[PDB]
Design a protein around this ligand. Structure first.
Ligand SMILES: [Hg+2]
Ligand SMILES: [Hg+2]
Ligand SMILES: [Zn+2]
Length: 257
């Protein structure tokens, strides 16, 4: 069962998920001097005002904040995207130290964490169907640096106690993901994959240039979570990130000059 340790971590995934060595795997290093401004991108539309969060869940590898996605409540459109993509869940990847934790990197710089807001292409009807398509998914990726507290993140931080171990969930309604956005919507975009098994190559990545700042205390609370389920040897949930993968035959575009 895949994880992030020595015996079941990213170096092992290809054995059960051969696509791990595929042609459009994620994450990737974003070489800022190789990415090219793309004037054919429309502005990005992040419409999260009617968002309907339901629950937070520790899934053994991270925590998902889940959303009701049966209607166009929280949606991503515009930018490199055709049509409407519905928010289904968000989650983070983080490190054991501030010097690591992000999945994407910018000129090889690792941020302390990365937030992924996962959306699925509404013409495919549901999420399961979206993941059979090369344009099924769009992930908004937002870097986290240690700094000032992010007030919009505190609700999440405060619930972590109650979902310490694998399989625990807690009610998590009326959470507003807008509080997790940086001021600018400048981004890089490339065709990629999910960064966890089964590593399906269904993703349009939209990675914001501007990181959000979180507090040391905020990040510290992420690191108190558990990989293991209740009553098992304690393995702190830390360093749940896949390192950068071969760019291969791919182009990263900027939305900004
Ligand atoms: Hg897991
Ligand atoms: Hg796909
Ligand atoms: Zn992720």
């Amino acid at each position: 069962h895949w994880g992030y340790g020595k015996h079941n971590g990213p170096e092992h995934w290809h054995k059960d998920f051969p696509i791990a060595k595929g042609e459009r795997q994620s994450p990737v290093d974003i070489d800022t001097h190789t990415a090219k401004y793309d004037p054919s991108l429309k502005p990005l539309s992040v419409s999260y005002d009617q968002a309907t969060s339901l629950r937070i869940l520790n899934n053994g590898h991270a925590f998902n904040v889940e959303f009701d996605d049966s209607q166009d409540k929280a949606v991503l459109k515009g930018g490199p995207l055709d049509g409407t993509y519905r928010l289904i869940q968000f989650h983070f990847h983080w490190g054991s130290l501030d010097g690591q934790g992000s999945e994407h990197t910018v000129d090889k710089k690792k941020y302390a964490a990365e937030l992924h807001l996962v959306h699925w292409n509404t013409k495919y009807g549901d999420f399961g169907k979206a993941v059979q398509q090369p344009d099924g998914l769009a992930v908004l990726g937002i870097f986290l640096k240690v700094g000032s507290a992010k007030p919009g993140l505190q609700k999440v931080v405060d619930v972590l106690d109650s979902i310490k171990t694998k399989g625990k969930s807690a009610d998590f309604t009326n959470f507003d993901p807008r509080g997790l956005l940086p001021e600018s919507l400048d981004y890089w975009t490339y065709p990629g994959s999910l960064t966890t098994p089964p590593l399906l190559e269904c993703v349009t990545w939209i990675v914001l240039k501007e990181p959000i700042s979180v507090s040391s205390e905020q990040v510290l609370k992420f690191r108190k979570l558990n990989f293991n389920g209740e009553g098992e040897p304690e393995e702190l949930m830390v360093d749940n990130w896949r390192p950068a993968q071969p760019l291969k035959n791919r182009q990263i575009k900027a939305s900004f000059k």
